[PDB]
Amino acid sequence: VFHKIRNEDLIFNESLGQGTFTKIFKGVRREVGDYGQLHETEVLLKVLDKAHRNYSESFFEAASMMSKLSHKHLVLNYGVCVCGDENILVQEFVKFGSLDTYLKKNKNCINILWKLEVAKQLAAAMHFLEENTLIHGNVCAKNILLIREEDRKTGNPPFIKLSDPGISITVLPKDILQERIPWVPPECIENPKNLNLATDKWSFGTTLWEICSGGDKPLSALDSQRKLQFYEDRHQLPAPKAAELANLINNCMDYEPDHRPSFRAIIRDLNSL
Ligand SMILES: CCN(CC)C(=O)c1ccc(Nc2nc(OCC3CCCCC3)c3[nH]cnc3n2)cc1
């Protein structure tokens, strides 16, 4: 179950953007913490749109997935506020935001070793989920958060976490699914109920492509009809700018889901460079 947070202990501050049928805000939670100390803690507030309240079950199931498992590379959920009409998910607030924006802002500053450390961390998180037979269903650079920047001076690497998947692709309208090509794998375009552990290996490949492309979005120039035809013609993504991980990307985005490598194998490949 989810810890219930009182509407009166939450303050909503600035809008940070939107997700799928959600609005996202920075906020503050008043709480009693360890030793009975009172705290005013920064939080990330995710609000399901009133118009799409019929998705509330999938909205919360997405975060519940993340919450029943504990791992260093998985975002922390603090609880939920159903107080009122609103359906509110309360999560930890990460200092440096999402990776897709960070890659773009810091293009001329991110080198191959940084990308490899990030890829290894994401692969570790996905290996944990695979070993627990937990499907994420929406692996992408927008859903990777940057906790700590790299510090060459101290030799410290960056540190990321994987966020929750949001409303599942098994209940979303087809036009949203099509726009999410090529993160959504071909078999889930055929039938979103084909969502499986193999789904996440495909999307991991798409996310590595993002990491290697300075925050470009693959196939963004293609409209939804042309994205569908891309899958129907069995195309692959072009090798990124920095081509060091192109082979791994292509091996991961295999049109045969049963041939996509395990995350253990993926980690072995990453460690070999
Ligand atoms: C000055 C420019 N920056 C970057 C430095 C910021 O303003 C910024 C934005 C967000 C955070 N933190 C954040 N972001 C999340 O999601 C990512 C956001 C979701 C919806 C909109 C896009 C971003 C989160 N999810 C779950 N805990 C989160 N914490 C930190 C800083």
Swiss-Prot record:
What is the tissue localization of expression for this protein? Answer: Ubiquitously expressed throughout most tissues.
Residues forming the Protein kinase domain are 10-273
| Record's subcellular location | Endomembrane system; Cytoplasm; Nucleus
Q: What is the effect of changing V82F?
A: In PV, THCYT3 and AML; risk factor for Budd-Chiari syndrome; somatic mutation in a high percentage of patients with essential thrombocythemia or myelofibrosis; leads to constitutive tyrosine phosphorylation activity that promotes cytokine hypersensitivity; no effect on its ability to up-regulate potassium voltage-gated channel activity of KCNA3
Which residues are annotated as modified residue Phosphotyrosine in the UniProt record? Y35
Q: Site (Breakpoint for translocation to form PCM1-JAK2 fusion protein): give the residues.
A: D175, I176
Family that this chain belongs to? Belongs to the protein kinase superfamily. Tyr protein kinase family. JAK subfamily.
Which medical condition is this protein associated with?
A: Chromosomal aberrations involving JAK2 are found in both chronic and acute forms of eosinophilic, lymphoblastic and myeloid leukemia. Translocation t(8;9)(p22;p24) with PCM1 links the protein kinase domain of JAK2 to the major portion of PCM1. Translocation t(9;12)(p24;p13) with ETV6. Budd-Chiari syndrome: A syndrome caused by obstruction of hepatic venous outflow involving either the hepatic veins or the terminal segment of the inferior vena cava. Obstructions are generally caused by thrombosis and lead to hepatic congestion and ischemic necrosis. Clinical manifestations observed in the majority of patients include hepatomegaly, right upper quadrant pain and abdominal ascites.
Q: Describe the function of this protein.
A: Non-receptor tyrosine kinase involved in various processes such as cell growth, development, differentiation or histone modifications. Mediates essential signaling events in both innate and adaptive immunity. In the cytoplasm, plays a pivotal role in signal transduction via its association with type I receptors such as growth hormone (GHR), prolactin (PRLR), leptin (LEPR), erythropoietin (EPOR), thrombopoietin receptor (MPL/TPOR); or type II receptors including IFN-alpha, IFN-beta, IFN-gamma and multiple interleukins.
Q: How does it assemble?
A: Interacts with EPOR, LYN, SIRPA, SH2B1 and TEC. Interacts with IL23R. Interacts with SKB1. Interacts with STAM2. Interacts with IFNGR2 (via intracellular domain). Interacts with LEPR (Isoform B). Interacts with HSP90AB1; promotes functional activation in a heat shock-dependent manner. Interacts with STRA6. Interacts with RHEX; this interaction occurs in a erythropoietin (EPO)-dependent manner. Interacts with ASB2; the interaction targets JAK2 for Notch-induced proteasomal degradation. Interacts with MPL/TPOR.
Question: What note about domains is in the entry?
Answer: Possesses 2 protein kinase domains. The second one probably contains the catalytic domain, while the presence of slight differences suggest a different role for protein kinase 1.
Name this protein carries in UniProt: Tyrosine-protein kinase JAK2
- Name the gene for this chain: JAK2
